Amino acid sequence: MELSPTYQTERFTKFSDTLKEFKIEQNNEQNPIDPFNIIREFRSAAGQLALDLANSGDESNVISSKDWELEARFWHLVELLLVFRNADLDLDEMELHPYNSRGLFEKKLMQDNKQLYQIWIVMVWLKENTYVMERPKNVPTSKWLNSITSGGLKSCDLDFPLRENTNVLDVKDKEEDHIFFKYIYELILAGAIDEALEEAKLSDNISICMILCGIQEYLNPVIDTQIANEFNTQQGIKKHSLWRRTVYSLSQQAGLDPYERAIYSYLSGAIPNQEVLQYSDWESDLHIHLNQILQTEIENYLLENNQVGTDELILPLPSHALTVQEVLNRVASRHPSESEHPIRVLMASVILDSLPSVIHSSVEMLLDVVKGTEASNDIIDKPYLLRIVTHLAICLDIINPGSVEEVDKSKLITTYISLLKLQGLYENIPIYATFL
Amino acid sequence: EKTSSDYNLWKLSSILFDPVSYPYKTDNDQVKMALLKKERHCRLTSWIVSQIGPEIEEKIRNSSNEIEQIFLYLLLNDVVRASKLAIESKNGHLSVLISYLGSNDPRIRDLAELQLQKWSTGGCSIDKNISKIYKLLSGSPFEGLFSLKELESEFSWLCLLNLTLCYGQIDEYSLESLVQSHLDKFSLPYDDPIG
């Protein structure tokens, strides 16, 4: 958001330079048709300036901090999509006989099927933008040591917390759990099996990292030599279907903490329980359902190769094929702040695929502003909101429209030119005027 | 007969020494050959489980403890159902370890050694047989710190062989070297024709 009108103008100047340069290159074939180097540089700038302002700790630098964080993301979103249009992959033209490794099939399917590459790309955007808290303040080398001392536990074992009705905790032990178990869950949504393996060992909580690693499959040269080209050693659990359904059943057991069940629910491929899910952002919730889709497609093929089994389904997984619209609605009941805030709404409509239609209603109001018959709308009471929507529309239409019709895109610009006079910038205007 | 050791002797030998071919031909011959041996092994592992069958089942019937029945299943290929009994009997702990059956890794070895050390040091020490399981997963149950050599005394030399063959050293070994490793940890009786 705003600091003062001074901070608002400057965002316009960075964006404008990037757009012009890109436009010249796209209409020459002597130059990179699709350049990716500049938007990255613009990305790296928005990003770093975001973080520096937050860390300064003044109130004026946080508000402004939001605006920089949004900017850097827009550059990234555009990047993944143009990689696809400027080169579709069709890799991993490995075997398909019904007797080979789970992993030889997994690579082969994902790369061939254009539809699964498009789901994978979207997920790559979501993962990054999932938030990880700060490092735990505990690394215990005897868990449950206070109850060990009394000897009600045979050891540092988790048998007793998975048997106990109310879940055996001490006041001290709840104080240990909360910081720790919250970090491992967040860590899990954002991945990194290597980091997880190293920590878990020290905190005598060794088992959970291994569960996260079970997604994996053969990557051994000994087994097949097409999965010799990705690691020299196998990994994970080669009874994936069994592991999902059993973990899911385990997730539903009570006499667990909400976290214990939540951790397992994610690892088994379900949305986490409502108590815990409310402290996570919109992006990750959505992301989990995209997981269900992606893996169902992979296992259908695995079934035809007579690998995956129907008997390994223990307690069925909760299926996910919810829309973007349902997802805004669920998130909004838990905290209406990321699914009733307008910018995050603009992001959603790209995904659901109704952005031109949603823009059109906005576009009618906007033209009136130009005509000077409106001046009490919530987008002229938010200078930043007009600036975001216009720039969103231009970038995707540089080659040709990818999610916003030309008419609308022009019309957003016309109003934005109207505003740019009012903020006392008239150098950015002749750039934007060309796209009209 | 199909209950007889004579049936078993002729049947086994084709699987062991002769290829059990695929209906197709692979892209590379090290995929050809690797999968060919793995094929022989797959069939073997299930077959052993069917023969040893009635024995394990008997013991499952005579055990009226949930936990104990849960262990007895894992000496088959009853992994499925082992999990099923564990959930129902209010035991989480047994389900977690059961989900990992059917694979062995350097990561899984690491789990087995550390979890045991932390337990028998920081704790007051885990049970005799839990610490025996840690030995099977680290990759030396019979030469392990808790020895399973006592388990001959209740379960046949073929069941003992079964353990190493399904779990321990599966893909860090070929099918040949894998059976040999079990012999170096615990030799089978010589009076067996089929052994």
Q: For residues A232 and A224, give the distance between their C-alpha atoms in angstroms, rounded to a whole number.
A: 11
Q: For residues B88 and B72, give the distance between their C-alpha atoms in angstroms, rounded to a whole number.
A: 17
For residue A400, what are the contacts with CB-CB under 8 A and spacing of at least 6?
none
Q: For residues A152 and A169, give the distance between their C-alpha atoms in angstroms, rounded to a whole number.
A: 12
Q: For residues A180 and A188, give the distance between their C-alpha atoms in angstroms, rounded to a whole number.
A: 12
- The answer to whether A412 and A390 have CB atoms below 8 angstroms apart is yes
Q: For residues B46 and B40, give the distance between their C-alpha atoms in angstroms, rounded to a whole number.
A: 11
- The answer to whether A3 and A64 have CB atoms below 8 angstroms apart is yes
What is the separation of C-alpha B175 from the centre of its chain, rounded to a whole number of angstroms?
Answer: 14
Residue of A63, A129, A43 whose CA lies nearest to A384:
A63
Buried b (16+ CB within 10 A) or exposed e, A65-81: bbbbbbbbbbbbbbeeb
Cβ neighbour number for residue B152 with a 10 Å cutoff: 15
> What are φ and ψ of residue A179, in 5° steps?
-65, -40
Please, what is the angle between helix B29-51 and helix B5-17, to 10°? Answer: 170
Q: For residues A111 and A298, give the distance between their C-alpha atoms in angstroms, rounded to a whole number.
A: 11
Place of tokens 């592991």: A243
Q: What are the CA-CA distances from residue B18 to residues B36, B41, B47, B94, B177 (Å)?
A: 10, 12, 16, 39, 17
Whether chain B has a CB inside 8 Å of the CB on A215: the answer is no
Chain A contacts in chain B segment 127-146 (CB below 8 A): 127
- The answer to whether A420 and A428 have CB atoms below 8 angstroms apart is yes
Cβ neighbour number for residue A178 with a 10 Å cutoff: 12
- The answer to whether A130 and A73 have CB atoms below 8 angstroms apart is no
> What are φ and ψ of residue B75, in 5° steps?
-95, -5
Q: What are the CA-CA distances from residue A192 to residues A205, A213, B20 (Å)?
A: 16, 9, 40
- The answer to whether A107 and A92 have CB atoms below 8 angstroms apart is yes
Q: How many Cα neighbours within 13 Å face the side chain of B39?
A: 20
**What residue spans of chain B are helical by DSSP H?**
5-17, 29-51, 53-62, 66-73, 79-88, 92-98, 106-122, 128-138, 157-166, 175-185
Q: For residues B41 and B176, give the distance between their C-alpha atoms in angstroms, rounded to a whole number.
A: 10
Q: Is the dihedral of CA A377, A378, A383, A389 positive or negative?
A: negative
Cβ neighbour number for residue A31 with a 10 Å cutoff: 11
Place of tokens 């009853």: B78
Place of tokens 């030599």: A225
Q: Which residue type, as a one-letter code, is found at position B40?
A: R
DSSP designation for A260: H
Q: Which two tokens stand for residue B157?
A: 């030399």
Whether chain A has a CB inside 8 Å of the CB on B54: the answer is no
Q: Which residue type, as a one-letter code, is found at position A115?
A: Q
Residue of A100, A241, A192, A267 whose CA lies nearest to B102:
A241
Q: What are the CA-CA distances from residue A144 to residues B99, B112, B124, B153 (Å)?
A: 24, 19, 11, 36
Contacts of B123 in chain A (CB under 8 A): 142, 148, 153-157
The distance of B116 to chain A (nearest Cα, Å) reads 10
Q: For residues B141 and B147, give the distance between their C-alpha atoms in angstroms, rounded to a whole number.
A: 6
In this complex, the residue of A95, A154, A250 whose CB is nearest that of residue B96 is A250
Q: For residues A302 and A254, give the distance between their C-alpha atoms in angstroms, rounded to a whole number.
A: 33
Residue of B112, B158, B121, B117 whose CA lies nearest to B139:
B112
Q: For residues B126 and A265, give the distance between their C-alpha atoms in angstroms, rounded to a whole number.
A: 28
The distance of A137 to chain B (nearest Cα, Å) reads 20
Place of tokens 């019937």: B61
- Residue by residue, DSSP assigns A92-150 as -----STTS-HHHHHHHHHHH-HHHHHHHHHHHHHHHTS--PPPPS---SSTTHHHHHH
For residue A430, what are the contacts with CB-CB under 8 A and spacing of at least 6?
none
The distance of A128 to chain B (nearest Cα, Å) reads 26
Q: Which two tokens stand for residue A414?
A: 């016309």
- The answer to whether A269 and A178 have CB atoms below 8 angstroms apart is no
Q: What are the CA-CA distances from residue A50 to residues A56, A66, A67, A346, A347 (Å)?
A: 11, 7, 8, 21, 19
Residue of A156, A216, A331, A22 whose CA lies nearest to B130:
A156
- Residue by residue, DSSP assigns A376-419 as -STTSS-HHHHHHHHHHHHHTSSSS-SSS-HHHHHHHHHHHHHH
Q: For residues A12 and A251, give the distance between their C-alpha atoms in angstroms, rounded to a whole number.
A: 49
Q: For residues B3 and A154, give the distance between their C-alpha atoms in angstroms, rounded to a whole number.
A: 44
CB contact under 8 Å between A222 and B90, yes or no, is: no
Interface contacts (A, B; CB < 8 Å): 158
Please, what is the angle between helix B29-51 and helix B53-62, to 10°? Answer: 50
Q: For residues B131 and B147, give the distance between their C-alpha atoms in angstroms, rounded to a whole number.
A: 9
A29 burial level (CB within 10 Å; 0-12, 13-18, 19+): exposed
- Residue by residue, DSSP assigns B123-168 as SS---HHHHHHHHHHHT-STTSSS--GGGGGTS-HHHHHHHHHHTT
Whether chain A has a CB inside 8 Å of the CB on B92: the answer is yes
- The answer to whether A303 and A278 have CB atoms below 8 angstroms apart is no
- The answer to whether A60 and A112 have CB atoms below 8 angstroms apart is no
For residue A49, what are the contacts with CB-CB under 8 A and spacing of at least 6?
A68
CA-derived radius of gyration, chain B:
18
Q: Which residue type, as a one-letter code, is found at position A422?
A: L
3-state class of B23 per DSSP? Answer: coil
Contacts of A250 in chain B (CB under 8 A): 87, 92, 95-96
CA-derived radius of gyration, chain A:
25
DSSP designation for A162: G
Residue of A423, A404, A402 whose CA lies nearest to A412:
A404
The distance of A273 to chain B (nearest Cα, Å) reads 18
Q: How was this structure determined?
A: cryo-EM
Place of tokens 């050694």: B113
Q: For residues A152 and A148, give the distance between their C-alpha atoms in angstroms, rounded to a whole number.
A: 6
Please state whether A269 falls in left (phi above 0), alpha (psi between -120 and 50) or beta: left
For residue A217, what are the contacts with CB-CB under 8 A and spacing of at least 6?
A101, A102, A103, A106, A227, A234, A235, A236, A238, A240
Whether chain A has a CB inside 8 Å of the CB on B33: the answer is no
In this complex, the residue of B100, B115, B118 whose CB is nearest that of residue A237 is B100
Residue of B84, B68, B100 whose CA lies nearest to B166:
B100
- Residue by residue, DSSP assigns A298-350 as HHHHHHHTT-S-STT-SS-PPP----HHHHHHHHHHH-TTSSSSHHHHHHHHH
In this complex, the residue of A157, A220, A314 whose CB is nearest that of residue B119 is A157
In this complex, the residue of B83, B90, B110 whose CB is nearest that of residue A246 is B83
Whether chain B has a CB inside 8 Å of the CB on A51: the answer is no
Q: Which residue type, as a one-letter code, is found at position A386?
A: L
Place of tokens 């840690």: B134
Q: For residues A369 and A346, give the distance between their C-alpha atoms in angstroms, rounded to a whole number.
A: 21
Buried b (16+ CB within 10 A) or exposed e, A99-121: bbbbbbbbbbbbbbbeebbebbe
Q: For residues A206 and A164, give the distance between their C-alpha atoms in angstroms, rounded to a whole number.
A: 21
Contacts of B100 in chain A (CB under 8 A): 210, 214, 237, 243
Contacts of B166 in chain A (CB under 8 A): none
Q: For residues A332 and A431, give the distance between their C-alpha atoms in angstroms, rounded to a whole number.
A: 38
The distance of A253 to chain B (nearest Cα, Å) reads 7
Q: Is the dihedral of CA A17, A23, A24, A30 positive or negative?
A: positive
CB contact under 8 Å between A253 and B123, yes or no, is: no
- Resolution number, Å: 8.1
- The answer to whether A161 and A167 have CB atoms below 8 angstroms apart is yes
- The answer to whether A201 and B110 have CB atoms below 8 angstroms apart is yes
Q: For residues A238 and B131, give the distance between their C-alpha atoms in angstroms, rounded to a whole number.
A: 25
- The answer to whether B82 and B98 have CB atoms below 8 angstroms apart is yes
DSSP designation for A271: P
Q: For residues B107 and A350, give the distance between their C-alpha atoms in angstroms, rounded to a whole number.
A: 41
Q: Which residue of A has its CA nearest to B172?
A: A222
